Design a protein around this ligand. Sequence first.
Ligand SMILES: O[C@@H]1[C@@H](O)[C@H](O[C@@H]2CO[C@H](O)[C@H](O)[C@H]2O)OC[C@H]1O
Ligand SMILES: *[C@@H]1O[C@H](CO)[C@@H](O)[C@H](O)[C@H]1NC(C)=O
Length: 319
Amino acid sequence: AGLNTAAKAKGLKYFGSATDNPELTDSAYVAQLSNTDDFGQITPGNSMKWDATEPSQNSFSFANGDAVVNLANKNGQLMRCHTLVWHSQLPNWVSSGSWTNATLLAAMKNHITNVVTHYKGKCYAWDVVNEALNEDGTFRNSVFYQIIGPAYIPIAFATAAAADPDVKLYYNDYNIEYSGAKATAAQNIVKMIKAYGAKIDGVGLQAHFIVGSTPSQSDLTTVLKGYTALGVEVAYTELDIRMQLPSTAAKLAQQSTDFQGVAAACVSTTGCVGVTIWDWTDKYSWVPSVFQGYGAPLPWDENYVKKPAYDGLMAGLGA
Ligand SMILES: O[C@@H]1[C@@H](O)[C@H](O[C@@H]2CO[C@H](O)[C@H](O)[C@H]2O)OC[C@H]1O
Ligand SMILES: *[C@@H]1O[C@H](CO)[C@@H](O)[C@H](O)[C@H]1NC(C)=O
């Protein structure tokens, strides 16, 4: 009957979607987000990030994150929880701080423990560290890397695992879905976390792709299997396939095949537990405001009508 039923028929745990709190007032939107034929899983796009959950040091704020969890709960949908440690969407107090390793570590760990404990039992997975890599596979020079060094990564994982030993702990990034230095470096992150003795369960592959320039199914699959070989699971976490505007029939058809290969790569890899799209309607995509001249990235259009990419996903899921 839909993306989520099809995914689960093939052994995935879910097909899901991100959302954000302003969208939850739109009844037609909510009705489709709440359609469990299509979505068995939800990710909050913004309300579990650091700025949203710890706007001042030791002063936590969960209303907006909780409202997304309550909608998934109402629907019987799983949650992915996103994201504990990331260089973006930090509150001023983190980015402007005069830190030592000891004082930043205490603040980071306190952030993790409080947010993960708050959501204990409520998340299928956490994206514990997000976007820690440069494109060449070096570490991104965030505040956390500059002050703490590489250890911030395993320390973050270990702190999350202490707070909630059951939730799947993921490393999440973009441009780690195709073969190259960045994906190799993401494998090396998995290895490093375990060499520290810390827990990592999954690799999250954002999958912000471009129509006509999407990784092939074969390379996607090689990359997925390069992570599952390490003894972790994998998921596509933020799938969207942005097109160079204007939209045309031919671009919409290409977009379909591009989405199809992503779904099919996940099915083909035992250990790929699911796909989440970064919202589901073009109306609410983050893409146009960030990638100038691109848009129409999702399987429904801006009036909530299915595009050819819906069918491409269904075909890649073998439905
Ligand atoms: O802020 C980051 C964006 O930079 C990231 O942009 C990448 C750039 O490389 C490719 O173009 C990839 O397709 C895009 O998504 O996307 C995640 C976001 O948080
Ligand atoms: C910060 O402290 C931890 C020990 O808590 C350590 O693993 C790491 O090397 C330190 N980093 C730096 C840059 O001093």
